[PDB]
Design an enzyme around this catalytic site. Sequence first.
Site: not given
Lengths: 339, 339, 339, 339
Positions: B251-253
Amino acid sequence: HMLGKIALEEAFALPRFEEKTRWYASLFSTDAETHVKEITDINKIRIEHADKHGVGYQILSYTAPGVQDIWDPVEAQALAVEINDYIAEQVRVNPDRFGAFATLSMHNPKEAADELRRCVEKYGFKGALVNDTQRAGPDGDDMIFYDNADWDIFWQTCTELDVPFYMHPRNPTGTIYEKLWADRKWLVGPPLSFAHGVSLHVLGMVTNGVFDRHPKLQIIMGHLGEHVPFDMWRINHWFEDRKKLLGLAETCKKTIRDYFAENIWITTSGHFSTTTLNFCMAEVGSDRILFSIDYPFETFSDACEWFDNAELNGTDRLKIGRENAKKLFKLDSYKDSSA
Amino acid sequence: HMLGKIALEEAFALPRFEEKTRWYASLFSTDAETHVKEITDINKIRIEHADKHGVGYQILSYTAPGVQDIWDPVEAQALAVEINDYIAEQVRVNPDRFGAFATLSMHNPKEAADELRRCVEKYGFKGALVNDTQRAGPDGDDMIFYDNADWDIFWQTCTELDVPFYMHPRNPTGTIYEKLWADRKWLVGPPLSFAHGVSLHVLGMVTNGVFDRHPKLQIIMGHLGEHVPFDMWRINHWFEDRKKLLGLAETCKKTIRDYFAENIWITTSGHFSTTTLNFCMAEVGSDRILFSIDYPFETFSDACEWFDNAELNGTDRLKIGRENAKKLFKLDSYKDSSA
Amino acid sequence: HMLGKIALEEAFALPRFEEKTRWYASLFSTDAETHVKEITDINKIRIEHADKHGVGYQILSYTAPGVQDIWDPVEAQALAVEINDYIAEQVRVNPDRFGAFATLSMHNPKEAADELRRCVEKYGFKGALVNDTQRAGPDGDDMIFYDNADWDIFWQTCTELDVPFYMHPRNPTGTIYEKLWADRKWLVGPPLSFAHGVSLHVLGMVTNGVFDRHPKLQIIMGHLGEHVPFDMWRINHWFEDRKKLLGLAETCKKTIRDYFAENIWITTSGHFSTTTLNFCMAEVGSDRILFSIDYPFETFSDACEWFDNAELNGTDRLKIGRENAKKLFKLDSYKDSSA
Amino acid sequence: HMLGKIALEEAFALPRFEEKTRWYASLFSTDAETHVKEITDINKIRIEHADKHGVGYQILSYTAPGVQDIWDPVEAQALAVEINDYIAEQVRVNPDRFGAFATLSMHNPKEAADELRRCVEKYGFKGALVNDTQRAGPDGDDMIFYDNADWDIFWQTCTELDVPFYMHPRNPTGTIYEKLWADRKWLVGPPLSFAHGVSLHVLGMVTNGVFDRHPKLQIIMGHLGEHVPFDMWRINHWFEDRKKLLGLAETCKKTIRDYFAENIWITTSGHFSTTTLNFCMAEVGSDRILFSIDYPFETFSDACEWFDNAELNGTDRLKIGRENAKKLFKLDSYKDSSA
Ligand SMILES: [Mg+2]
Ligand SMILES: [Mg+2]
Ligand SMILES: [Mg+2]
Ligand SMILES: [Mg+2]
């Protein structure tokens, strides 16, 4: 390259808590098997690491959440007594490489004072390391803070023995965890929640007059002070130019800068940043900064290769690397202490 | 000495909330009478201050806790509509000195989007300013965060209009206030609790993928980023070398540094420290730092005499002082905008 | 790790000067055989280094002391023309990896101007690189400085063609060497003498009004600016608060900070220090700093491992690494220029 | 606001040299009449300034160029003796406010040694202050440097008496002035020429092994160290990774960082910059930095308002302000020495 460094935020766990250790590792390790070996080992792997990376002496302490997770006061006290006796035996193998901090149940001020006194007098422990507030109440959802008058007997025991107290973080639980953290759980631990807890607790001690009633009390924070140096100007401004005119001066007689000069220390555990280190040297002074690792959640290699190779003047490399801790912990002669 | 500066964390209150204003002032002012006059005044005292201290343009916003204090959603929405219409009238007196941020009820993503859209389209407002979480639930003790998928329609409205969102702090209330703050109440506000709230909320947006789903979203933090620059190394380490191997990457690229380069801005409100400013220039870049005051909780004199006289290179004094805000808010031609 | 980096203080020597190259290497290299091969190589070893270390583009220039060592103006001019013709052919082999600065004899302003013009207009060279003053007079014991009106035609040529001028250092010679340096010869070069020469020449241009008569002229200094950022406060104080009231204002219309904002650039050549770079970010600004190496006197590995791994915000890493130079030199695409 | 400060780069001139004093003031003062009165006054104006600005103790020294301008060694020695006798009498008036450095003719090592000894043993002077090299030869066009074996007897006298030596700058003269500075004369003095002279002389002492043969010798540099901390990384690199492999190690046994940790001091004279001071704290360390003013070329107000109001941790403010100097000069009580 620097030898005889001192590290003092270095954790162990009891071998009988392997299940708890592995759950914790699932949060904060990418190699659970090595973590389990390293956090339980005292005298073999840990010494090999120290020998490779120029760490002469380490002050060991119990992993978080540790005894602060235990809201049954009788079990909590028994666990701390057990840990203290256990680690005292283990460090006799290498007394010139290892000291220990007392592990304490903090349900009761006098009980904690007595066990700290026992640890220092019987075992030569170097002070206390406590993971923020003590879990209490029927389901553990209450928190015991130490920034009030009930804890005067404890702080006075710290100053009588002249040993420091290290305020280490622990994870949020119960209501606080559900309300603020569950929907953003990746922020739990080093990314954010650890500093929020320790800084609240230590600034609480500041503004509740703990260092006024106990001017000789030495308090240590890891991770370059849990955000507090960043706001030194902001806190000082909102104390001396605001709240100190609205009643804060009733229970807080010095400036936040005074307390960092006279009472509060920070360490480099888990924060291997020369840029932040330099900023901390300006806001708190090289004299008040101690090397530390945060092993085995951090590796010796990250911490020591950073510190040994950081661009830094020779005076402060020596002070931060060992000489500050040497004077604070009255340390004479450990391995490579003057190399 | 520098003219045409831009400030954008500058609060007003409605004249009809004098009792609420005075209670708040009892917490955060040492001159309640001047505070009441200054926080309600728009076009006289505030302009005299700006004229004396070289501030050409200001983006006004509503005082905290503001609409976020209102847990009745119908009253909260009506209050925000009223504030927005009120401030839009007041700033027409000096359109080359004043813009405004939308004041929003944040109980409902679409409701907030619509009112932000109304403010921007009808009034030319410059974005939104929100005081952390929206109070909700039967007694106001619930908090609404915006770092989840329900708020996608709102963030998409910010990027469609291409306006920034300023995440301002507010005081702790209810259970959180009782549990963590009541026994150390002098830490409420600027000394500590403000940053703890905003940093939690913005890093929540980081780790919940808000800036992945909305890559053009611009988010602004006051007070030099609410501790976050201090831990840039620590957060990045515990993301890329730890949590991003345990599931955070779902959820955090991007890295936390990427998000500060592409999405997050900080301002100098309430933090008039050149030493911290320099440290922030290294950890976030002069391009991402905006001048701001935090008036009337801070004075123009503290903020502007600090900034005007700070040792700083000419390039960054211009950028921080006005030119960054000029490009971000698509500002052409206000008083002294190119002086 | 950063790709597409631009370096622009990178030297070469003509094959036929192997004797001078080895004598210079006996001063400044601990591996003379490798230095000989590296300083004469253009298209093989230099490319391999650049491929290993993320350097997409290099602007090549002639080693010091170069043409500035030649006090026969006819011999000097002929070597300059020879060198420019040679390097223009060499860089055709890999035009997407290499540009060149003009090499000049600086005995005569109009002569230097015409040969710079030829280099730019015939070969597409990106500017000029000159090793401080031109040796002149019967035995080369005189020095030609360029901070005076006789050189206006030259500086006007730089601004007409819109290409920068890189003030590189060279060894002290003659009377200056004998009086100041011969008895402390290990200070010659990078340790001290180099910066003393360049800083004197560039600050001469400031205080003799070159940038006043040529406000578009761009001047580049290596080695994080040859001490000048260290004394930015001190120079600015002794200009604006002192000498500007005694006569300096007659030939010097702006502050030293203006000229660094508008005319002067610095590079990281031979100064791989994050602490000093941060300080230069405060005193000159990230927009005015260019990555560079100083090969083959410095290695690609030293320069690039430092910069690629230095703690730095993402915006300034991209600017210092390539984007500042891409704009100043109006560069087309090159290897990894947008990677 | 800090009381009991110690300054030690504070000049005086003999009344009978009013003509030389006014000529020097036409170079370096914007208020010649005040400068004349201030540089000759010892016990009235100087005291009032110090009382207004929290300066308890001052070590006085003779203005530049002073005795170093005199190339007749008989005339030079007689002026030195004259000056020391004069200042010793002047400082008896207020011995708790003033000390003095010895003024020396540096034509002959044994002569300089004996007059330093007399000053220390007869008058209780705290060290020596010398304005860079001694002018010598028939027309004063030669320079005597002290970084060689002929000066061992002098440096051994400094270490026997255990008192520091302050390397102060002086203007360039003669051939050096004509060749380098005459065409850019506004650079003479603080803007540039001063630091070039001192840094060359002190780094000469390093690389010619003075501190190797005299490991207890203490050397002081004004103006935050005359550029040297800026190049600490660069100097250390080009020593340890380069020149130390080519011959420097023969006469230079330690690193530049060692010598700054063990032998070299810097002062804040004429460099009232918190940004640069922080950088010097990183590169040399707060333990090695001394407050100082450079009066009457600088004002008490500039120096003291800067230092008293600079954002700085409390530990280093106390050390730089007075405690570093109290220890290095073994000072007894003086006005406000513990205030
Ligand atoms: Mg830890
Ligand atoms: Mg505010
Ligand atoms: Mg070079
Ligand atoms: Mg002086």
